Structure 1
């Protein structure tokens, strides 16, 4: 029993974290085989921020300008290339701790673990979601750039996020591991801001199922709803539309608990309209939306990772 915001074990990623320095700029890099991946603006000074031409900045650099440290070991850069907003530094040593891995670009609403790092050394691990507005509500300070987000399946690490920027509301923007930003954000100094966000409906429903699995039913009711009438209410409360695809994905949780998806939707509707009346669900006085249906199944079934 119990239900926690659970991160993936981070050891496979810890062994990949390094420090990259360019002039006075130091940030984190990801060392996989003989390549180190990091944000391209490591090559930026403070002056090259208004509208930096990164191709022009990069052609002016030499391999020996890049100082890459793994622990107390300096790694020599022997090639470099820019891919979108990521710099790929070819180094003279392959990382002996390279896990099985892939690079994935995730959809909004998906969750992942962040290994927050400073100066190439891990500080902490936490779970978050890609918001519908393509920000993440992270915990990142100066020096955190190049920290990565990931999922693990069996023994395979799927990297999905590299950290780049903090927006004026205190939320975070970054790229996939091929250097493409999530959302409309850019790595130049402009008036960018997070767009209006929405609540991840399919995840709220997943978490209500988690609550039932863990022995709590106070919020259930005898009613059902149509998908259309539910979405009319969701829309009013700034919830994402629930698709038939979302309904299918919730099938296993609905089967495990015996509560039809549209029945759980009628519970959520009632919760939106009436509030919790001073009660809590899984220790929360708010409706939690950073657990996917898969997160719930994994934690309530005890899936492990080799």
Structure 2
């Protein structure tokens, strides 16, 4: 028993991290097969960041201007191309540590592990969620750009996130591995609206099921509700509306616990309306929304990679 915010084991990804330098800028890249992927803003100077002309800046660069180092080992760059907001540096050596992998574009409310890196070297790993507003609440310093987010299924790493930017509000923005930003963001040093966030309702419900499995049951009540009634409450409290698709995804946890999804919604409604009265659930005094239903089952059933 017990319930923790658990990340994927990071080893498969650690073997793909390299350092990329262009001029006086160093950040991280991801070495898969004979391609290194990194944020395109490695080519910028400080005077460029206000609104870089990336096409013009990249024209000034040649293969030999990109220094790519894998531990102590220098890689030879034989092509470069820009795809959306990422560069792809073709190298003459396939990464011998390449895992089975996929590039995926994840949906808001899904979770993944981030391997924070500096100078192509891993510093730590943590789990987070893609917010409904397509930001992430990470832990990232200067030099972290190019760090990646991922999920693992058996032996296959699905890469979903590459870090690009900290917004002036202190939350984080980045792209999929084809260089497309999540959200409306652009890679320049400007104030940029993220727009209203909401709490991930289906994840909160998943975590309440995890609480029950773990014996934290005090918040279970004598009430039920309807999707319509609950969604009125969801609206007031800036929660995502719950759909039947969400109910369907919660089915396995409902079955395990014997607690109908709408009964659990009625518990959540009461917590929203009354607060926690100085109590905790799974070690938290807030309602936690960074665990998906898949996350809860995986952790509660001991799936390995």
**Are the counterparts in 2 of residues 168 and 193 from structure 1 also a CA contact under 8 Å?**
no
**Are the counterparts in 1 of residues 30 and 37 from structure 2 also a CA contact under 8 Å?**
yes
- Aligned-pair distance for 1:46? 1.3
Q: Deviations over 1:117-172 (max 9, x none)?
A: 00000000000000011100000001000000000001100000000000122110
CA distance in 1, matches of 2:168, 2:4: 29
CA distance in 1, matches of 2:192, 2:84: 19
Q: Which residue in 2 is equivalent to 1:184? A: 184
**Are the counterparts in 1 of residues 30 and 38 from structure 2 also a CA contact under 8 Å?**
yes
- Aligned-pair distance for 1:10? 0.2
CA distance in 1, matches of 2:192, 2:112: 24
- Aligned-pair distance for 1:55? 1.4
State the SS of the aligned residue for 1:125: strand
TM superposition outliers: structure 1 runs of 4+ over 3 Å: none
**Are the counterparts in 1 of residues 168 and 191 from structure 2 also a CA contact under 8 Å?**
no
- Aligned-pair distance for 1:223? 1.2
- Aligned-pair distance for 1:53? 1.7
Q: Which residue in 2 is equivalent to 1:169? A: 169
**Are the counterparts in 2 of residues 20 and 27 from structure 1 also a CA contact under 8 Å?**
yes
CA distance in 2, matches of 1:164, 1:297: 31
CA distance in 2, matches of 1:225, 1:251: 17
State the SS of the aligned residue for 2:303: coil
CA distance in 1, matches of 2:167, 2:194: 7
Structure 2, unmatched stretches of 5+, are none
**Are the counterparts in 1 of residues 206 and 291 from structure 2 also a CA contact under 8 Å?**
yes
CA distance in 1, matches of 2:151, 2:279: 33
> TM-score under structure 1 normalisation?
0.99
Over the aligned positions, Cα root-mean-square deviation in angstroms equals 0.7
CA distance in 1, matches of 2:216, 2:51: 54
State the SS of the aligned residue for 1:199: coil
CA distance in 2, matches of 1:143, 1:50: 18
**Are the counterparts in 2 of residues 28 and 146 from structure 1 also a CA contact under 8 Å?**
yes
State the SS of the aligned residue for 1:298: helix
How many residues matched?
A: 305
